[PDB]
Amino acid sequence: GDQRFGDLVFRQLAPNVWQHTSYLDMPGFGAVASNGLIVRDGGRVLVVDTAWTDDQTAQILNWIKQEINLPVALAVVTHAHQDKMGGMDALHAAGIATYANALSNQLAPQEGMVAAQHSLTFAANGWVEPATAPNFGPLKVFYPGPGHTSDNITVGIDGTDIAFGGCLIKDSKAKSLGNLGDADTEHYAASARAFGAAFPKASMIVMSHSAPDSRAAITHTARMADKLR
Numbered sequence: 001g002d003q004r005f006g007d008l009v010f011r012q013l014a015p016n017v018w019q020h021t022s023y024l025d026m027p028g029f030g031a032v033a034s035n036g037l038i039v040r041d042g043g044r045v046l047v048v049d050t051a052w053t054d055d056q057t058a059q060i061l062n063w064i065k066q067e068i069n070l071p072v073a074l075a076v077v078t079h080a081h082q083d084k085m086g087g088m089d090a091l092h093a094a095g096i097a098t099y100a101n102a103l104s105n106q107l108a109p110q111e112g113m114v115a116a117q118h119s120l121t122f123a124a125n126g127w128v129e130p131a132t133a134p135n136f137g138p139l140k141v142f143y144p145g146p147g148h149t150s151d152n153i154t155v156g157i158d159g160t161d162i163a164f165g166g167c168l169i170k171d172s173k174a175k176s177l178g179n180l181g182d183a184d185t186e187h188y189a190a191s192a193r194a195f196g197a198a199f200p201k202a203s204m205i206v207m208s209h210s211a212p213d214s215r216a217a218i219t220h221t222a223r224m225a226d227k228l229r
């Protein structure tokens with residue numbers, strides 16, 4: 001029951017939650033998928049992660065316009081790499097307020113990305129400092145520690161069973177942790193387990209590069225990351 005709009009695929013996960021999937025056309029290689037989320041919060045919409053490109057990101061917004069027809073209040077993007085912040089200019093062109101870890105914003109130039117307009121900061125226990133995430137509705141933002149990158153954050157959707165691991169979590173049948181070029185191999189396993197512990201009741205785990213999985217994705221990612229040490 002998936003829907004396509006241009007280059008994007010949408011899947012409804014819950015009454016008020018959809019997964020957006022965008023594809024990098026990677027000369028000579030297969031299209032590479034990356035997933036994010038769209039959340040309807042009463043009379044507004046909230047977005048987690050851009051698509052790979054600005055053009056693809058404008059497609060997300062147009063699909064929202066057509067299928068949900070509520071204003072998009074804000075987006076949270078989950079680290080400074082192309083699949084998560086590639087479409088920043090498109091969000092800003094559309095007048096969507098954007099939030100990212102302060103560290104994502106600092107790293108953004110050196111990663112080729114455009115910084116968000118607002119910086120999230122985090123306590124020692126990983127939870128976002130609430131003053132930096134005003135009016136986030138059901139979005140619960142958690143920094144689990146360095147793993148896939150030093151800046152990677154995660155989001156839980158209150159009132160649902162869903163939590164989003166972004167590129168930190170890989171699916172439970174995975175044979176590898178994907179792109180480790182900017183990874184913290186020492187702390188990765190702890191950071192994956194911290195995500196699990198922050199959202200103990202989530203039973204649907206959404207991630208960047210596989211279809212939604214159960215909590216098995218968390219423990220399997222940790223067990224793989226254990227061997228990086």
Ligand SMILES: O=C(O)c1cccc2cc([B-](O)(O)O)sc12
Binds near residue numbers: 084
């Ligand atoms: O950056 C790119 O051009 C790129 C090109 C092809 C694959 C990927 C995967 C990425 B991630 O965030 O999952 O570390 S970034 C990336």
Ligand SMILES: [Ca+2]
Binds near residue numbers: 089
């Ligand atoms: Ca751009």
Ligand SMILES: [Ca+2]
Binds near residue numbers: 111182
């Ligand atoms: Ca890099």
Ligand SMILES: [Zn+2]
Binds near residue numbers: 079148
């Ligand atoms: Zn990445």
Ligand SMILES: [Zn+2]
Binds near residue numbers: 034083167208209
């Ligand atoms: Zn990724």
